[PDB]
Design an enzyme around this catalytic site. Structure first.
Site, mmCIF file in Angstrom:
data_model
loop_
_atom_site.group_PDB
_atom_site.id
_atom_site.type_symbol
_atom_site.label_atom_id
_atom_site.label_comp_id
_atom_site.label_asym_id
_atom_site.label_seq_id
_atom_site.Cartn_x
_atom_site.Cartn_y
_atom_site.Cartn_z
ATOM 1 N N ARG A 121 8.102 -1.365 -21.726
ATOM 2 C CA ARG A 121 7.902 -0.982 -20.344
ATOM 3 C C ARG A 121 8.112 0.524 -20.121
ATOM 4 O O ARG A 121 7.452 1.097 -19.271
ATOM 5 C CB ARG A 121 8.748 -1.827 -19.391
ATOM 6 C CG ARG A 121 10.224 -1.620 -19.497
ATOM 7 C CD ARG A 121 10.964 -2.425 -18.450
ATOM 8 N NE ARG A 121 12.407 -2.248 -18.587
ATOM 9 C CZ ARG A 121 13.301 -2.556 -17.655
ATOM 10 N NH1 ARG A 121 12.911 -3.053 -16.489
ATOM 11 N NH2 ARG A 121 14.590 -2.353 -17.889
ATOM 12 N N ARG B 64 3.158 -4.970 -10.429
ATOM 13 C CA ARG B 64 4.156 -4.571 -11.419
ATOM 14 C C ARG B 64 5.123 -3.617 -10.770
ATOM 15 O O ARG B 64 4.750 -2.841 -9.886
ATOM 16 C CB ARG B 64 3.528 -3.857 -12.598
ATOM 17 C CG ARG B 64 2.653 -4.712 -13.387
ATOM 18 C CD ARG B 64 2.892 -4.652 -14.895
ATOM 19 N NE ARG B 64 1.984 -5.659 -15.397
ATOM 20 C CZ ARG B 64 2.321 -6.907 -15.674
ATOM 21 N NH1 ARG B 64 3.596 -7.281 -15.645
ATOM 22 N NH2 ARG B 64 1.386 -7.757 -16.066
ATOM 23 N N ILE B 65 6.357 -3.639 -11.251
ATOM 24 C CA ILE B 65 7.385 -2.739 -10.754
ATOM 25 C C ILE B 65 7.170 -1.354 -11.349
ATOM 26 O O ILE B 65 7.105 -1.209 -12.568
ATOM 27 C CB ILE B 65 8.777 -3.267 -11.140
ATOM 28 C CG1 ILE B 65 9.033 -4.632 -10.478
ATOM 29 C CG2 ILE B 65 9.862 -2.243 -10.763
ATOM 30 C CD1 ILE B 65 10.280 -5.352 -10.991
ATOM 31 N N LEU B 66 7.031 -0.352 -10.483
ATOM 32 C CA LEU B 66 6.872 1.026 -10.939
ATOM 33 C C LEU B 66 8.205 1.547 -11.457
ATOM 34 O O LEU B 66 9.241 1.321 -10.824
ATOM 35 C CB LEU B 66 6.321 1.895 -9.821
ATOM 36 C CG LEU B 66 4.875 1.557 -9.448
ATOM 37 C CD1 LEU B 66 4.524 2.140 -8.086
ATOM 38 C CD2 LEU B 66 3.900 2.023 -10.516
ATOM 39 N N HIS C 230 4.887 -4.753 3.578
ATOM 40 C CA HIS C 230 5.558 -6.040 3.566
ATOM 41 C C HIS C 230 5.175 -6.803 4.823
ATOM 42 O O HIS C 230 5.146 -6.211 5.911
ATOM 43 C CB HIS C 230 7.069 -5.841 3.515
ATOM 44 C CG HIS C 230 7.847 -7.107 3.425
ATOM 45 N ND1 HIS C 230 7.967 -7.823 2.253
ATOM 46 C CD2 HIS C 230 8.544 -7.794 4.357
ATOM 47 C CE1 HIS C 230 8.699 -8.899 2.470
ATOM 48 N NE2 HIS C 230 9.067 -8.904 3.740
ATOM 49 N N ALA D 285 13.347 2.184 -6.369
ATOM 50 C CA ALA D 285 13.580 1.592 -7.697
ATOM 51 C C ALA D 285 13.328 0.081 -7.827
ATOM 52 O O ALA D 285 13.054 -0.427 -8.935
ATOM 53 C CB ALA D 285 14.967 1.973 -8.225
#
Ligand SMILES: [Mg+2]
Lengths: 205, 213
Positions: free
Chosen positions: A71, A97-99, A115, A148
């Site tokens: 990752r 995907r989580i940046l 959201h 994050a």
């Protein structure tokens, strides 16, 4: 404090993983005197968003997690690919995907998510079902800075819950407002910039 | 079993108050002509502006003070009897500085209304406006909900959003919310009187009009 200056005429990169419905609204808006252009769409998998981009003659880049050893390696690659387009703003609302920290090092303050609730109410992946179960009469959409999923809020707009709604009908009504809100927030951020003090984001003059 | 509160128009409303009576004033102003309810009494637990406002409007005022009873349960029985004596269809307790007890709720659950200056379940408690401002939301609002044994937890009857503007302080935002809050409560009282309500789970559904029409 975070200071992001105005960038109009701004270069926008959209990161996407899905059906591209939001991308459709951005492409439709980002013409003429709108203060930004979609310069590229980045995807992490084959998806309709990539097809929508290509149909609009927008360059598409692909950075799949599976094509890298870790990752961290993927994070470096997607950061380089996104930065290659010299964006002023990144929309990642449709990206699944989580940046990572390399990406955020470069793009925090300039990366936007959405959201389908009025945060901080009903966080998480089931915010619509949760709002419906709670019996609220007003929910909404939120545009916020990626970090994050509790980043500074840029814009919100309310959406009514109608008697007899199911998750699908409510979620669709919220998504309608989400698209308009995101288009407006991108324009405001491009023209005004933003400053963040505490966790409060304020659009500039 | 769903709780069903039938229509009650022309409805009798009791207001329970402990403070400045701003909401009482809005209800008294609204409850004229075709409005489907009237304020029949105001109950207080102390000397307050609300009691003076009621008297100024020729509405009877009753007083049930905690100190005048040997226990909280004794007070609960007394305020329940005093409220019930007016045969109310609805009770508004948003301005009341006492938790309503189980004797009161045994009689009046489903007919007792509170308000809150946020969109519940966000920003519960006595600092809801300050907390919304500090969190940096752009939309807050007002909620009307049924009173139950919790605080800020009962079924939601009505909500309306209120924007947070750049430069707002607590007082400016609170003013904007309070104006909406009082109106929302006045509208919810009228809808409850005319249409009634059904509660299933924690979801409250107002009755519907029977003609366009
Ligand atoms: Mg309250």
């Amino acid at each position: 404090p975070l200071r992001v200056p105005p960038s109009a005429p701004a270069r926008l990169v959209v990161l996407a993983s899905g059906t591209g419905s939001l991308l459709r609204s951005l492409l439709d808006a980002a013409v003429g005197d709108y203060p930004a252009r979609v310069v590229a769409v980045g995807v992490d998998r084959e998806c309709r968003a990539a097809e929508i981009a290509a149909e609009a003659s927008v360059p598409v880049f692909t950075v799949r997690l599976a094509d890298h050893p870790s990752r961290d390696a993927w994070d470096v690659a997607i950061t380089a690919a996104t930065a290659a387009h010299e964006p002023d703003l990144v929309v990642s609302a449709g990206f699944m995907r989580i940046l990572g920290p390399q990406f955020l090092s470069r793009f925090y303050g300039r990366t936007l998510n959405t959201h389908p609730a009025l945060l901080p109410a009903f966080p998480g992946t089931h915010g619509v079902a949760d709002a419906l179960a709670y019996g609220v009469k007003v929910t909404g959409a939120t545009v916020h800075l990626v970090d994050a999923d509790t980043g500074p809020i840029l814009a919100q707009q309310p959406v009514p819950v109608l008697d007899g709604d199911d998750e699908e009908t409510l979620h669709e009504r919220i998504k309608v407002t989400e698209r308009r809100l995101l288009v407006a927030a991108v324009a405001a951020l491009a023209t005004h910039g933003v400053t963040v003090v505490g966790r409060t984001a304020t659009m500039g003059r």
